[PDB]
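From: lab user (bench 3)
To: helpdesk
Subject: output format question, protein + zinc ion

Hello, I'm new to running complex predictions and I'm not sure whether the block I got back is the full result or only part of it. Here's what I submitted:
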Amino acid sequence: AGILFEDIFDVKDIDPEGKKFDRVSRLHCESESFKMDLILDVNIQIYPVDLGDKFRLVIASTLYEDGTLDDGEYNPTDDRPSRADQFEYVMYGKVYRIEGDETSTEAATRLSAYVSYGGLLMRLQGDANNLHGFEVDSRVYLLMKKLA
Amino acid sequence: DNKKKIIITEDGEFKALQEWILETDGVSLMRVLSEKDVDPVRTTSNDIVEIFTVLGIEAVRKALERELYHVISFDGSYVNYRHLALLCDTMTCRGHLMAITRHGVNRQDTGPLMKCSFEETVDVLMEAAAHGESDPMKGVSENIMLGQLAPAGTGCFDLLLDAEKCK
Amino acid sequence: MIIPVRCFTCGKIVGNKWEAYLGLLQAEYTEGDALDALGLKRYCCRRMLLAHVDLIEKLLNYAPLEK
Amino acid sequence: KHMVDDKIHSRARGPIQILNRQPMEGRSRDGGLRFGEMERDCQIAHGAAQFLRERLFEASDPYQVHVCNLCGIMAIANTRTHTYECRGCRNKTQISLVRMPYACKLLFQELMSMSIAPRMMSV
Amino acid sequence: MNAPPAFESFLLFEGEKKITINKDTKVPNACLFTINKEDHTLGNIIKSQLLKDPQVLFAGYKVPHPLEHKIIIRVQTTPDYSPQEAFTNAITDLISELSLLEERFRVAIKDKQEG
Amino acid sequence: IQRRLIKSMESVMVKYDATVRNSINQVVQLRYGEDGLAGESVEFQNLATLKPSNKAFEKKFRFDYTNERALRRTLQEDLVKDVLSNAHIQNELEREFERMREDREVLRVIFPTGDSKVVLPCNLLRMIWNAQKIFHINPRLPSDLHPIKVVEGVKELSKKLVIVNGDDPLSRQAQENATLLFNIHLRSTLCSRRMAEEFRLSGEAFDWLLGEIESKFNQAIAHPGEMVGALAAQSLGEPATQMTLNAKNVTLGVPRLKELINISKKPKTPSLTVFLLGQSARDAERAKDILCRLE
Amino acid sequence: PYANQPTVRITELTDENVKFIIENTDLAVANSIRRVFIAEVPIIAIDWVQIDANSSVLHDEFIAHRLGLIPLTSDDIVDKLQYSRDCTCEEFCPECSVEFTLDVRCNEDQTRHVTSRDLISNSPRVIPVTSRNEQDDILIVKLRKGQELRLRAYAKKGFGKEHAKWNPTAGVAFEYDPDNALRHTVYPKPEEWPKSEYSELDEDESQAPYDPNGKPERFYYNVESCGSLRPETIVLSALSGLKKKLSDLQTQLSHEIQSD
Amino acid sequence: QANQKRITTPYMTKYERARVLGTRALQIAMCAPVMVELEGETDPLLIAMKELKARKIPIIIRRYLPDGSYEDWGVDELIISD
Amino acid sequence: QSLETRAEIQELAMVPRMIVTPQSNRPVMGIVQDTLTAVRKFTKRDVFLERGEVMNLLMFLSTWDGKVPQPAILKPRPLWTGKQIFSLIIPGHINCIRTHSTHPDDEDSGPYKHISPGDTKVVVENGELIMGILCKKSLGTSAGSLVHISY
Amino acid sequence: MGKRVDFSARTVITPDPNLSIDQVGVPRSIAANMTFAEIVTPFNIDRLQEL
Ligand SMILES: [Zn+2]
Ligand SMILES: [Zn+2]
Ligand SMILES: [Zn+2]
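Helpdesk reply: Thanks, we reran it on our side. This is the complete output you should expect:
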């Protein structure tokens, strides 16, 4: 499939530290199916998000419905079936950090994957079982859709 | 912390002890050092001449490096240490405090032409004439005056044609 | 020394407005109302008429070189 | 008043001063720009010895003198008849050609005016 | 002293080509059009018209130096298309747009003067 | 002041025997900057073994070859078995830690104030980061780098970084001194433990890192023919043009710089900094007693 | 992949300016039209002066520069005249130039205003705008008794790229998105800014709600004429000139493509 | 001095590179034979840099030591960094 | 006036060879007034460039491989970020950590150390500006800046 | 130690964002006044004859 992670999140706070940027807003959200915290930077100018909203987030390694790698190059004249068709807000970034609660001897029970979508930062932290698809310096997509 | 007493605790950490220090308006380093309850190891002065007279040439070398560093860095600036070290070695390599003046620079065996370039052109050349001094043309000033390639940078070596490799 | 022909900024002609401007000023117009009467609505052309110093009138106080 | 057209200036082998055969001073004199002591120090720091020699010897006042290999004093050369002789040493065979700045020749002559003997010894 | 004549911005020098096409080797199906004695007036419209072509992948222009009087327009198209063909179609479309705009402005002026 | 400095240092130059000498051929420095390195290539770094405590130093730099499961997390299976079974390797690592502890004491006497900021040729942390990204090092997986390979490679690297050339004992000691601080930084940065649980480099990454360190160090060496004297005069006179002309009042800026470079027998504000020995250093009454005995 | 279908709506047409709106066109097309109004709409202007006598207090270049900036009616003649580059004649001819003569002498005691009315042309169609059959005449120079100005000018065809004297506009107001809906501007305090004359907002509303899917359309123009051309002639000549620039570019493009 | 043991650096200094390139460029400009192949190069500096990259400059650098001796290094024997 | 002096200047005194000064082992030239105010504004988190703007800017990259990068935002509308274009400007695969001048001092202690609320804490990895607002501290003449690490 | 030199020029400096850091924008009059003595070879015989 090419999907590293999928869950439904609920916006629990927007800009706790205050609005830092005008067109960008930080959402602190939590899901229900996996109990994962999410910090996400979104361009609220084009995709406004209100407190208490509920959305489906899908971290993917590729947009093509069939398992097929991406070249990281912009190809607007691409007629393949892309899973971005099923979502409203889509970003493209790279994983730049994976933290955990590991010790010198024990493995990590909880992980924390950090992604940067051209400067818009995301932190998806929760159980390490749900974050095996994430590897540092790896390109991913956001694929986020609002639901009622 | 630059004037506090930095010790190493028994655990191995650096600890800055907050202790009394005295700052005088004159200098008698010779006497103050030899006083009871005065530290004869860290007590110093900013008068480099007294440091030279009391502690010697390497002590004044180090102290002069410290004072020049203090002058340079007080405005937050930073200069690579090799430049201060080279300046301080120039002033102390001959066993005495060589001022950067005619009284220190034109009193070393640098050659009359290098000296006339700096200061006291006529006095220097006249002294060299009276004493028959010979300039070996080792410095850059002497070669520059004679229009010759200074032994500096691209002039510090010679090039030869390689007859066996032109084939 | 003399009223410019065009406004330096837009290029509107102001050369034909200096005499009318002075005539309006002696007609007890304020400088703003005078500039409004001449149709100078952009503050660049108002700058041109309002800041002009007619030095040519002083240069014409000297007799020419030839009679 | 400071318009660029009254400041722009360039030189390439123009007139030279009479005393020291170096470029004149000023735009009005079609003079050359001064490569001063600080420029010399900068190029010494750069290590550019040939550029330094070009600026301070070859682009300013190249000159040649003939020196007696014995007394090191500037000899009398006659290149048309090829007769070189030092009146001091009374020799006419051990003379050498030396390429020096004209200002340095002028300096050495002004020192000889002061009874100083700057002897350019080529050995 | 150093002022170029004002016509040098508009007039071609003898033996100087109005437009030169050079293949861009970095990516396939890309070209550089170096147009002499033009400026942002044509560059901007040609670029923006080329951006309306879905077969154009890249369309940009630059005036490399304001004191110089040329523009460079880089055009990359899809493999089935050509940057020269894209540039030609962009100019054709701009010409047709301007012809239509001129006719409609004539009609609007006629209406305004008449009633 | 600038002209005076220049005329005083103008002919000091790095010679082809790597000594810094003046026109008279007298020796001003046996190696430029005491390390024979040019000032363009060096950069700010941190000595990692200077400030930490003995416990922290032990915990961060002593390779722990007893914890089987920790090694299992850091190293691959064959490396874990070789490290746990072999005693030659364990003695090699033990002597590595002893050598780092000796280096720690040497740094402690070099920097009596706990300032780990140092200026050294090669930015080893940046090179390690470069190796991590060039070879796509996964910090979460066990590494295939043998700690004995780290020890041996660092030792060979140290042998290849030569500022003073010669097999004679005097050249050996001068070589030891020229690269002492850098070799301490290198042994404390390329430590086997740090390379196992902090950087987690692979064998390929470590070999590339060793080569990169060697090449950049050889590039940082001063070039014979550098007019370091004119360069130093300029480096000290250029900042003088910005610093100002105008508890206690102390002369600073260009006036103090002048007083220093042209040896003044009558400084403007001559002063001492008297430091106290015993309880006088702590209490104020005895400090006042010494003050009265001085003033 | 094809052209726009722009529409036009002229909201004011006088002898002094034309105020119109172009809709359904790209911002680049609108700004190139705006630029051509200023820089590539040819007109006639004095570009050659021969001073036979000037006893006035302004030197010769002052008078020449001042004559160059007098607008000359260029409406139907500018299309017919050729550039002196293209004319196959000598320095001048009636096919590429228009001759003016000026000959004034202050004999009387009051100051004589040498104005644009004194510029006498050989061509009746190309005359100073103020001299056309109110607004006074442009003042060339004031003369004192005994001062005299006699010169002979030639006017040429050119556009504003070469010199601002060939610029036919006295201001080109250009605007789009009067309510900041595209947010191409970002007002720190939108309430502090006055409303555009083309705004359609109630006074409580400072700027329009942001339009994420919006593009610049509906460009508003106010082309004021210096006098040489009628404002609508400026706009029509601008469109024709831009179209001929593109046509020449396409011709040269075809030669370059076929030569490869 | 024993050529079997040369104490100077095995690297070409920046000043050695500068002067060798300038010297060889002047030699090429004065119609000296070129040691490398040439595609279309006509600038002597470019030809000299190509010869240095190819390690085919027929020049020997005589590095003088402070004691007065010297060491002769072929341009091909030195390590070219830049 | 000679090939030898020309080679001397070209190999010793050329400006790129002069970027780092031996005086203080740091760059001597950096990014300056308009380019520095603008790069600060450009690398803010809420700078989004459209396709035509991005192509306009890529026309002015000399060291561009001709590949348009995948925009940071694909939907509802393709938008590139200023960091995404500066990543194309940044050369090689250099790695650099800096901090914007407005970086709060108590942020590196608490949470959000690696996800900065203020977009401070510059991080360049593999020659991509992963995060942070560039300023004097990142592009000026100080030690360890991007221009220094690039050199 | 310092002297006047030939093949030098001086004028006011001006910004130019479109030059690289290692470039200097020179007027055509300074460049027409200043000259570089280029040696003739079969490599440059034609170009130098053109000049
Ligand atoms: Zn105006
Ligand atoms: Zn003799
Ligand atoms: Zn004609």
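A quick orientation on your result: Residues 3-12 of chain I form the longest helix (10 residues). Let us know if anything else is unclear.
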